[PDB]
Amino acid sequence: VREPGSQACLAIDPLVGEEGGAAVAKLEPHLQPRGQPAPQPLHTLVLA
Amino acid sequence: GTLKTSNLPEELRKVFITYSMD
Secondary structure, eight states, X not given: OOOTTTTOOOOOOOOOOGXXXXXXXXXXXXXXXXXXXXXXXXXXXXOO | OOOXXXXXXXXXXXXXXXXXXX
């Protein structure tokens, strides 16, 4: 008989870098609000 | 609303009309 002492099997486990991983970022455009005095289209009429 | 007046010079105020009798 032989003993597995020296030849024992190996388990594996990755060295995950999640602890130092950057996050996913969401973008939102800062709308030029119409609540603030934004301009409007100058629909014109004629006084005949 | 607000009022407005055009700066259209007098030279651009000339118009010509072509038509038929009916």
